[PDB]
Amino acid sequence: SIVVKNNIHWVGQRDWEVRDFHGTEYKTLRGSSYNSYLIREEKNVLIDTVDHKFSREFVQNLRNEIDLADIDYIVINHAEEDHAGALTELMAQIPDTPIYCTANAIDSINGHHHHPEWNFNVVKTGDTLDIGNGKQLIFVETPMLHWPDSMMTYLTGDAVLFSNDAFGQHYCDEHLFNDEVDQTELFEQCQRYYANILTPFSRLVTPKITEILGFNLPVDMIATSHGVVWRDNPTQIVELYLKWAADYQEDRITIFYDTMYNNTRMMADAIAQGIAETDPRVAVKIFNVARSDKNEILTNVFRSKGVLVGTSTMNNVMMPKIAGLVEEMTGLRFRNKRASAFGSHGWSGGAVDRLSTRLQDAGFEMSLSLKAKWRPDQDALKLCREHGREIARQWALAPL
Amino acid sequence: SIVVKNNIHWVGQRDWEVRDFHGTEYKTLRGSSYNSYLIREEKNVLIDTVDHKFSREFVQNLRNEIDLADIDYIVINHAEEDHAGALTELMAQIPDTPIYCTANAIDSINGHHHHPEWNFNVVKTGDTLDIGNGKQLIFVETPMLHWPDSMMTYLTGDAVLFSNDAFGQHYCDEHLFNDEVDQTELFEQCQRYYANILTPFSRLVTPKITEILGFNLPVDMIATSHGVVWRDNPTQIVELYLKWAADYQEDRITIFYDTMYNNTRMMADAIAQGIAETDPRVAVKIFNVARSDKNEILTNVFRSKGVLVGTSTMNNVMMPKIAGLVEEMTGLRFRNKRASAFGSHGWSGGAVDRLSTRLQDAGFEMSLSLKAKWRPDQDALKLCREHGREIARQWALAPL
Ligand SMILES: Cc1cc2nc3c(=O)[nH]c(=O)nc-3n(C[C@H](O)[C@H](O)[C@H](O)COP(=O)(O)O)c2cc1C
Ligand SMILES: Cc1cc2nc3c(=O)[nH]c(=O)nc-3n(C[C@H](O)[C@H](O)[C@H](O)COP(=O)(O)O)c2cc1C
Ligand SMILES: [Fe+3]
Ligand SMILES: [Fe+3]
Ligand SMILES: [O]
Ligand SMILES: [O]
Numbered sequence: 001s002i003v004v005k006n007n008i009h010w011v012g013q014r015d016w017e018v019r020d021f022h023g024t025e026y027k028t029l030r031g032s033s034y035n036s037y038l039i040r041e042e043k044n045v046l047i048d049t050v051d052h053k054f055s056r057e058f059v060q061n062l063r064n065e066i067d068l069a070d071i072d073y074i075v076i077n078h079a080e081e082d083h084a085g086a087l088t089e090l091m092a093q094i095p096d097t098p099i100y101c102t103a104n105a106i107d108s109i110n111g112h113h114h115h116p117e118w119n120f121n122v123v124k125t126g127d128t129l130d131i132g133n134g135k136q137l138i139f140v141e142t143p144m145l146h147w148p149d150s151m152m153t154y155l156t157g158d159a160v161l162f163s164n165d166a167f168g169q170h171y172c173d174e175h176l177f178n179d180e181v182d183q184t185e186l187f188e189q190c191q192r193y194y195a196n197i198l199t200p201f202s203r204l205v206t207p208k209i210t211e212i213l214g215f216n217l218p219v220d221m222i223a224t225s226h227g228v229v230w231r232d233n234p235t236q237i238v239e240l241y242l243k244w245a246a247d248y249q250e251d252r253i254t255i256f257y258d259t260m261y262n263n264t265r266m267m268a269d270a271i272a273q274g275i276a277e278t279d280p281r282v283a284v285k286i287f288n289v290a291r292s293d294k295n296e297i298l299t300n301v302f303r304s305k306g307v308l309v310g311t312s313t314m315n316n317v318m319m320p321k322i323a324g325l326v327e328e329m330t331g332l333r334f335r336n337k338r339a340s341a342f343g344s345h346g347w348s349g350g351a352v353d354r355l356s357t358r359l360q361d362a363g364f365e366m367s368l369s370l371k372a373k374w375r376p377d378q379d380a381l382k383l384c385r386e387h388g389r390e391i392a393r394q395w396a397l398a399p400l
Numbered sequence: 401s402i403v404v405k406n407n408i409h410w411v412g413q414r415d416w417e418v419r420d421f422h423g424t425e426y427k428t429l430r431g432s433s434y435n436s437y438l439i440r441e442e443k444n445v446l447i448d449t450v451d452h453k454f455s456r457e458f459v460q461n462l463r464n465e466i467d468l469a470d471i472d473y474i475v476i477n478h479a480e481e482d483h484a485g486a487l488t489e490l491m492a493q494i495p496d497t498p499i500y501c502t503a504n505a506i507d508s509i510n511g512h513h514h515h516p517e518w519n520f521n522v523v524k525t526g527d528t529l530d531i532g533n534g535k536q537l538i539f540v541e542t543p544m545l546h547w548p549d550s551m552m553t554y555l556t557g558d559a560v561l562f563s564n565d566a567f568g569q570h571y572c573d574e575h576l577f578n579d580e581v582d583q584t585e586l587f588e589q590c591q592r593y594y595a596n597i598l599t600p601f602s603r604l605v606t607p608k609i610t611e612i613l614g615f616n617l618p619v620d621m622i623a624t625s626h627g628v629v630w631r632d633n634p635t636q637i638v639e640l641y642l643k644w645a646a647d648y649q650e651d652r653i654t655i656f657y658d659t660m661y662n663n664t665r666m667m668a669d670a671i672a673q674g675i676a677e678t679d680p681r682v683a684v685k686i687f688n689v690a691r692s693d694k695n696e697i698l699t700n701v702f703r704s705k706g707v708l709v710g711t712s713t714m715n716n717v718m719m720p721k722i723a724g725l726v727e728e729m730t731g732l733r734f735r736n737k738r739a740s741a742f743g744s745h746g747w748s749g750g751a752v753d754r755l756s757t758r759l760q761d762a763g764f765e766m767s768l769s770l771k772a773k774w775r776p777d778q779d780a781l782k783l784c785r786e787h788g789r790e791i792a793r794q795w796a797l798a799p800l
Contacts, residue, residue, distance in 0.1 A: 023660040023719065024690045081661050108746070111774025112661075148747050200715050260423040261481050261512075290424045315600050315731030319423065324724030331715030346508070347548050374511025 012036040013054040027295050031172030035225050042132020043072040052085030068094050076101040077164035078150045079108040105149035159220035167237040168224030169193045179232035194244050195302035200333040205245035247335040254300040256287040257310025258319040263344035263375050264310040270381045274388020289321045306338035306395045313351035330362040339364035344372050412436040413454040427695050431572030435625050442532020443472040452485030468494050476501040477564035478550045479508040505549035559620035567637040568624030569593045579632035594644050595702035596695050600733040605645035647735040654700040656687040657710025658719040663744035663775050664710040670781045674788020689721045706738035706795045713751035730762040739764035744772050
């Protein structure tokens with residue numbers, strides 16, 4: 001274990017190896033950690049657990065810290081596999097230990113573990129749990145941030161906000177605190193996490209933060225369920241979350257596509273040239289969805305004012321990886337972003353129009369599409385380059 | 401080179417390494433070959449070329465066989481990259497050599513190579529090209545089998561049908577003829593090819609074969625553009641194509657899904673049990689689309705009377721790999737097949753209904769969906785098992 005502050009002990013698990021989250025839809029290229037906390041005051045309180053893969057390690061490590069029978073309360077901020085996976089193993093040893101969680105958490109905990117006989121205590125925003133020595137826990141409901149059952153737990157005196165998933169990131173490191181790790185890598189993992197997971201709930205982020213700020217609770221540390229404990233200027237990640245939630249965009253355009261004979265790739269590169277020579281302020285990124293990291297593509301979409309998506313026509317429809325990515329973007333609900341579909345075809349085509357419609361269905365404001373037949377010659381490449389110019393002029397944040 | 405028959409020389413290229421075709425949408429697990437043929441009678445005729453990766457090897461190997469200036473005619477059955485990729489390199493040495501192809505091939509050849517100054521000769525069904533010694537080429541147009549430009553070339557006397565893509569397969573072997581290779585592996589690669597490439601054009605296969613049969617042309621060998629030369633009972637692959645084109649299905653059900661916490665997987669396995677204990681005649685296959693070979697999944701769909709597709713709800717939509725696969729199936733146009741969508745959800749769900757609709761859009765006859773919340777308990781697994789029973793009864797090819 002590691003001392004977070006005073007009697008707050010980190011009893012979690014580092015994961016140097018993990019690469020796949022949520023099936024294979026989130027790639028953790030820098031590993032992750034599953035943060036669990038044991039508070040030892042007059043009462044002993046366990047906050048969350050860890051991923052099911054480390055269930056036996058978690059309980060054994062917990063035994064080394066404390067007699068399991070001496071644990072008074074268990075707090076479940078969020079009943080996802082990677083935080084509540086070792087719960088069954090733990091409750092098998094101490095089945096009478098009370099669990100404090102939201103009403104929705106009773107449904108999600110019972111939904112996986114199938115042990116409704118456990119002693120649940122529904123908490124709502126403002127509810128308190130005294131743990132002695134003048135300290136108490138204050139619970140804050142945060143539904144759909146990012147699950148119906150989600151909440152945060154605040155510890156008075158020590159002024160530590162146990163935020164669970166919120167403000168966390170998938171970043172594995174031997175050091176626990178934010179000021180002890182690589183700042184660039186930390187930011188990248190934080191932004192990657194928000195972009196790929198929290199984007200659809202951005203409308204809920206600012207009101208909830210505003211609500212919490214109204215509570216006037218001092219914050220010395222933010223202890224999340226993933227990655228570092230924020231202790232040095234801890235509200236920096238809160239400020240980032242406020243920025244990211246406001247339909248975030250930079251002067252940036254992301255271009256991605258799939259291609260069978262590189263015809264659409266040729267179009268994509270020419271489009272990029274047209275943009276770059278029209279608006280020097282715009283940053284451009286290009287990805288082949290079949291050869292690139294999907295989560296990196298989505299992080300760039302999140303960062304972009306607009307996107308261009310390319311596909312050739314394959315059996316009268318679009319290429320499947322493009323269809324898959326557009327479906328996923330539809331779920332993420334990007335806002336105030338623009339889009340244009342492009343691609344090559346052999347005869348009757350149709351995938352470009354089909355893609356433009358689905359981009360619109362995903363919530364993008366659509367500009368005109370760009371089409372070409374077979375491999376673009378010099379004349380066709382000029383048209384693609386002109387398309388990039390036209391797009392750059394239209395999507396300009398400012399004149400010229 | 402290798403002697404196919406008499407003065408017909410195989411001047412193609414084996415590809416032991418290739419794993420990706422059409423971007424990454426076709427996995428060639430047993431490599432492939434690109435078959436090109438040089439006929440040396442009174443006239444010298446080159447039939448097709450090879451993939452662009454082996455362009456320099458192709459021309460050099462061709463030089464070792466014949467003075468390039470002595471090549472009289474070039475026949476392009478089909479102007480796809482993997483057959484016309486070395487054409488530019490070749491025509492750079494012999495630019496005056498006439499090219500015989502369909503009208504649509506002029507558009508596809510010029511579409512990639514951008515050399516309209518080449519000497520094209522449009523051929524249509526029944527047209528002939530005398531090459532001396534009492535032998536002639538007879539051309540047969542086969543539009544949308546599988547490209548607009550596609551055709552076949554028949555050589556009289558030797559009775560060899562140069563079928564290009566048709567009846568071919570991605571199977572790399574040192575031996576050239578069908579009777580010299582592993583028969584099981586040959587069948588598997590043949591069926592994999594038809595299922596993943598030719599399925600949407602099945603309605604065109606039987607009429608074209610019937611037309612060709614009416615020509616009463618003797619067939620000693622079928623020399624395709626991929627894999628083996630059919631010399632021993634060569635029409636066996638034609639008979640397979642007739643079977644496969646007739647909305648082919650076996651008493652088989654394919655189940656595939658994606659899952660984040662294995663909840664949908666649990667449903668899939670229970671569904672399979674219900675099927676197996678209801679109808680012993682049905683063969684069942686189960687795939688996780690994120691962990692399986694996509695082309696194998698599609699080959700099984702092709703072989704199946706029906707499918708069940710699983711997804712959990714992810715940000716109010718379906719999992720992207722499932723969305724991608726359903727798009728691809730929409731393009732393949734499977735016929736006379738049934739489907740049922742299933743999956744787990746956390747709260748409001750919606751992906752199962754969404755998937756059922758898109759399966760219907762893909763052309764499947766839909767049965768009722770199966771839904772469950774979080775991880776299925778014993779009661780829920782009984783319902784899933786009952787769903788498999790109900791599906792097995794409904795999709796029964798015969799009573800009981
Ligand atoms: C398997 C396959 C299916 C195709 N289906 C269509 C089609 O349905 N309609 C069409 O216009 N072109 C079709 N084409 C032609 C491609 O769209 C054309 O080659 C395009 O220029 C390739 O673009 P890309 O290199 O970006 O993949 C198909 C090509 C392949 C290889
Ligand atoms: C990233 C993520 C997003 C989710 N979005 C939804 C949703 O929008 N609606 C819903 O009902 N459940 C949602 N869920 C809950 C899952 O559908 C639920 O956990 C389901 O039982 C998982 O099924 P699986 O194990 O087959 O993936 C979401 C879960 C995750 C991890
Ligand atoms: Fe988490
Ligand atoms: Fe081919
Ligand atoms: O999580
Ligand atoms: O091909």
